[PDB]
Structures are given as C-alpha cells and as structure tokens.
Symmetry: D2
Subunit: 232 residues, 4 copies
C-alpha cells in the first residue's frame, strides 16, 4: 500500500507527483523529499488498497523530465524515535537525519514519539545505530527500527513496585503515553517492595517504547521494566 | 533459497528430512530442531537454487508420518552472537536460547578444536519475532565475566561496512597490527590510514566485506589495544 | 572549615543552634535537618575561621536539653547532582534522598547543578551509588561525590570536532555552564572530522560535570569528551 | 598506620628504606616504586603501631642523600580492581596504571581481584575513572576506590530468582568469591519468577564487587543484583 519513488526531477512538488500518479486510485498521503546531493527528488506515496499501489509499480523505469524513475514497495524503512526535547519540531528531526547523511522521506509527530520513513532498509538500521543514545539538551535520544505485526514482544514486566504503586490506574496513566494498552495484569494478593505487574500493549513498538520506564522514578521507587518471558 | 519445515514427526533426523526433500532440487544444508514442548521437530533446508525452495513449499499441508507439516520461506530469522566463554559449545548456545523459550533452528560455530580468535556463532530461529526477541533478551548478558553481544543479521554501498578507529598513538598506527587486531571479526576489504598524522588523535578507517563483520568489530570500542583505549564507531556515510 | 552537630533536641530551631554556638566565632551559615526517624536534629555550621570550628568541637559530648551532642569536622560528605528536571526545587531533591533514607544536611541550588551535604561519608557514596543514572521525566540523573582541591582531573579533551566547531567562543558558551573555565586550548593548524580541543576547568568537579557533554550533539556532530591524559 | 614517603633517591631499595625508618617503630611491610620519569622513588611503609607511623611523619622534609623527602599518612589511596583476564599478573596490572601515567605503589594479587595502592587521592579517583569499563580480551574491567569502615553498603538484594535458584547453598557458592559472607537471608515461603534473597557481606568492598552479578546468568536465569535500601 506504500510506494517509494526514486530519481524525479528536482523541480517536483507534492502536486506534480500527485498529478502524475492520480490514475492509480485513491491516495491518502503524498510526501516529497530532496535527495542527498539535492540534484533529484524522492517521493513517498501511500495508497488506498494493495492494487492501488501495484499500479504505481507498473510505472517503474519510466522517463519523467529527463530522469528515468524507479518505483518500488516501501518496505522495512520505518523507525520510531523518542525522548527528544519537547521544543523539537519536525525540522529538528530532519536536521538530525541530515547530520548523518540520511534522507527523511516522511516524519509524523503528534511522552511523545515520532515515526520516520527513510529511503532504504540500510538507512533505517544505520540511523538507529548512529543516533540511539545521542544526548540533546540533557535528553538521551531513543530510537529503534519499527517492529511490524504472539504476546511475544508486546508484554512487559514491571518490578520493584511498593504496595502503594500496585495500582491499576497509576500504571495505566504512567504507561499510556507509549501506545495503546490492551491489558494490565496484577497478580493476586502481593500483600519487600518486590511487587510486580504485567502490561500487554497492542503493538510491539509500544512495548519497546515502554522499556524507557526501566531505571525510572515512579512515585518514590526506582522501577524495573523488561520484556516478559514468553509462555512455555 | 532456505526453507522452514514445521511439525515434523518427533523422530525425524537430518537423513529422513533429506530423503523426503531431495527430490525438490539440490540441497545444500539440512538442520533439524526440537520444538519447545518436544512433541515435534522443525527443520531448516537450504537449497542450491530458488526453485528447489519453491518445490519444497509445494509440500506444505502434506502428511509426513502422522503429522501435517507446514513449509515456508525462511527470511530475516538470522542472528549472530559472540563474546561468549571460549569453552562454550553449540549445546551451551542452544541452552541459552532455551532459557528464553526460543527454538534454535541451527547454530553454526567454529569448533573448540580451532580455538578461533574473536569467535562468533550464526544462529537461525523459527520466526522474525524470535530473532528480535532473542537479541533483546540476551544482549549484555554476563556469562563468566564476558558481556554477551548479539545482533540480528544485516544482509547485503560502504554504508555499515566501514568503521573509524580513533585515539590511536603513532606506534599503534600500523596496518599489520590493525589487520591482526580486527581480522577475527570477519573479512577485511581495505585498511585506510590517512597520511600526515605522525596528540594521540590518530585514526584509521577499516572497510569490511559485509556489515555484520563491521558490526562485530564495534566490540573494539572502549577496549585496550597495545597501551591505549581505542574508540570504534561506524564511519559517517559519504554525501 | 565546617562542623557537623549530631543529636540536638528536635525542638532545636536554626536560631537556637546559632545562639548556642555564636560564642565560637563569626558564623557564615547554619543549616538544620531532621533525623530519619525525626527524633533528634543535625546541624551544619560553617565558620569564618578554623579555630571557630575547633571551638565548636570542644562543645562535643556537652549536654544540650537532655541530649548529649556530638560535634566533628564535616569532611567528605559533599556531592553534586545535575540533569534533574528544570521544574525541580530544593524540596524535590530532599524527597529523592528521603526515598533512599538519607538525610540532606543542606542543599544549595543556584545547566543547573546542586551541591548537597549529608551526615556521613558512607551516605555520600551510597547516595551516588543509588541515584546516578536514575531516569526522572526522561532526564537521566547525574551524581558524583565532590572532589576536593595539578591539571589532573580538571582537564578535558573534546574530540570528533569539525573545522566549523573548532571555535574558542562556541566551546566557551557550550561549557561555561559546568563551572569556571581557566583555559581553552585549541592546537594550531588542525584545519576527516576528527579535531580536538583541550579545556581546563578551575576545579575538578566542573571537569567531571563537563563529561556529560560526551556523546552529545554539538551543533551538528556527536562530540566525545573525556578526562585528558596526564602529562608524564 | 601506613605511611607514604616521596622523593627518596632513585637508588633506594626497600632495604635502605627500612634502615632509615627502623628507629620509628616496628615495621610490617616495605614497598618501593619508581617515580613516573624514574628520577626518584616512592615508598609505602606499614608500621605495626600508630605511633610508629606518627614518628615517621616527623621525618618529612628531611634530606636523605640529596633529596628532600616528604612523609605523610597514606590515606584513601586504595582501589580494588577485578574482571581482568585470568592470565593477568601483577606486572600486567602495573602496565595498566603505567598506560595512564599513574604510579602503582603496591599491588596485592592473590574471580580474583586485586588491591592497588597509589600515591595520591587524585590518582585513585583518576585511575578508576580511566580504567573502569575498559575491555581487555572481552572482559569488561571493574574498579572502584576502596570503601573503608552498619548494614549500609554491605547488603545486596538478589531478584529474578526461580524456585530452583532459591537455595542458601548455590547462593553461597556463587557469591563467596567476592569476599566473606556474613549472612544469607531468604524470606520464607516464596513457592512469579520474582523470588529474592538478601546477602550481607563483612565489608562494603565485597558487596560492591558482588554487584557484578547483576544482569548475569545464574543457572538458567538472568539475575538482578543491587544495594539493599537502608532500613527506615
């Protein structure tokens, strides 16, 4: 349903691409981005259905302006990025990626996280290595390559809780910012500040993001957070 | 070219699996692993050519023994692991993965007979999620004083194959020395040492044949080389 | 230079303490704190002169109210803390120490940092052991015991600099927040993005704080920062 | 009751050092080490009785041969170091300190650990800061300044244990390499992979070393290890 266009003439809008690709069916989003050396352009076109996108692909190797274009499935080029400074806008992200010679196809921003699409699988991985753990104005940056769609990877275990902290509302509100919570599970009657609880997120990326809560202050305790063991 | 077979009878060995699939095409590797609860076996079959694999897939939903099998493309289920104890055997690695309820489809490992320097193991698992999970659970684990390093494999233009080495002294700026210091991480394509350097801020660029090698080589960051602590990072990609 | 008073009666105000000791010499500061279990008090009295403190020490084992008091030199009980949330007040810091059962003898709070005195050498170390790297609202806390008053431990080296970033002012601006700079030294004619600079802080604590700049975005590059090697 | 002599003539061995000081009181140990540039010697002398050392300090500023010596209390100049390769000798350990231009006054090398004495308080802190986390042959080096000498900083908590691992004996066997164990406490009846044990060590250096067990494989589980909270 998503498509990468490579090597369009630099003089190309979202509109110019939209008018070239209109005849393949309903388009939800069209994003345009400058090449590294600024001589050509990339495009991310997201479609309605599967065949809406497969029509675009049958327009690969075609000549536009004086550039032959490549059109292929945008697959596994997506990372998320969080714990950057509150003031950070979209440009700031694009700037980070520009610092390490990586094109940002698209950035979607609203404890806020951003989802980023790049132009190649290697770029997504390389981005993560270089930037994860970078400090910016006191904030340690956190990135991972997206983890697509079996509790495996979606379940976290929260440890070192007191009795006072073993409260379903608190845990909810302390974790919801990472993504949708499917279920919170607090094993019966833990009446040493060694209480725990399990939380299952809807998607893997939220569980990953939640791992930031590890070694963090919750109320008056340092909590521990990790991926739960998978059911035997 | 590689293929997954799920739900084989619990008594199927490499041979029986080979016997069954040999007629699909030339087969390069067969590996067979127990399921978690030990009631069936998985197998990994690597064909010489893509159509061997295609023909194996057509064997999906067939009955073998008393079992209905599933056959599918095995893709992105490869991780590497290293800096385990020198005495670790392939059983040890399998026991680890078991500790976190992961079936290891195959484990290839330089045998103890070889005493290989900077020894690393490739491990195949049964699902993409397993590889990601496995790296996350196991990385940084401490075994007999060694801190474990694992990453999902990264398959194949200099991007991610090139490392920069910093904090080198004049005496450490020796091509043979670096070659020797890093060659265990995987094949070296080129060692590149800018002239004029001879503040202990000497640097060297090393390019590896593949990205997984350049990744493992990052273990040399914060490590003692001769008499200095060098720093190793992935080279900034060229604009 | 400074004195610890232990086992004062709980009713003992700062004023009352100041009154009891004011016949020892001029007093710069008086600070009072509750015991963990709130049944006596500690005081921190800083004097103008040494004999002033030695005078207060002769007051050791004397009976105030119905409490036998103990007076010693306050030595090696000082830590600095930094990279807490900007919203954090003095009371917030005291809460932290109470979460790990440590009395804050005094907290002084002006890239802000806090200086905290505690009631024992072990408390200082335990406190650092327990709180360093604790994530609070996305800020990973940094603490260290103070390092008392030649280049050793005061000189840092900044690496991975670019030609553009090799600016005396830009570095000064970027680092003076950690404490007084004595000397910035940029080795002539370095003009592959591996430039360096040396900076000498007036005191060691400041150098230690500056280590936070390691692995951090400066302008458009990740810099590395470490204690300089020491001259043979 | 240990003393540090600085600027002895470079030709002084432990023998003629012993003779110069033998009249201060009985001596248990003499260690002699070369200055960085080999132009003088340090000695570490350990006297049997306090007044022995006290008498040696009055030798400070005396001329020996052609050198003005300095004599002082060797205090807070000790670190321990652990997780180096099994084949490391005293010589290898001297080599490390030399690499960072720190004189090793003495080294006691009996999971082994070494105690190392250096010639200034700064050098001990500096030495830990440079060396800690150094990777030698895949072993990440651990070092801390020693911690002199109720439970505070001597008690650890071990979490994430299973039913199988909750055994007085396997715990003793697993932790005794870090130093003498005073007590092992397992809170009754834990038969959620959340089991825990408390261990008290005779001394804080031992507890600190045992923190190494944190994030380590014990049997079939990754254990968690940390300093226990101090009891309210």
């Amino acid at each position: 349903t998503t498509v990468l266009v490579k090597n369009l003439p630099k003089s190309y809008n979202q509109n110019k691409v939209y008018k070239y690709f209109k005849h393949c069916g309903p388009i939800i989003h069209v994003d345009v981005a400058d090449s590294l050396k600024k001589n050509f352009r990339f495009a991310r076109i997201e479609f309605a259905r599967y065949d809406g996108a497969l029509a675009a692909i049958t327009k690969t190797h075609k000549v536009v302006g004086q550039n032959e274009i490549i059109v292929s499935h945008l697959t596994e080029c997506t990372l998320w990025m969080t714990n950057f400074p509150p003031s950070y806008t979209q440009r700031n992200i694009r700037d980070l990626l520009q610092d390490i010679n990586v094109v940002a196809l698209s950035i979607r921003l609203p404890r806020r996280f951003a989802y980023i699409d790049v132009t190649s699988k290697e770029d997504a991985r390389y981005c993560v290595e270089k930037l994860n753990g970078l400090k910016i104005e006191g904030y340690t940056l956190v990135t991972k390559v997206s983890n697509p769609l079996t509790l495996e990877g979606r379940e976290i275990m929260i440890r070192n809780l007191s009795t006072e902290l073993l409260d379903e509302n608190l845990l909810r509100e302390s974790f919801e910012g990472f993504g949708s919570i499917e279920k919170i599970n607090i094993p019966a009657g833990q009446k040493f500040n060694n209480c725990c609880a399990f939380m299952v997120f809807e998607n893997k990326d939220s569980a990953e993001r939640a791992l930031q809560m590890n070694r963090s202050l919750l109320g008056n305790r340092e909590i521990s957070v990790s991926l739960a063991d998978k059911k035997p």
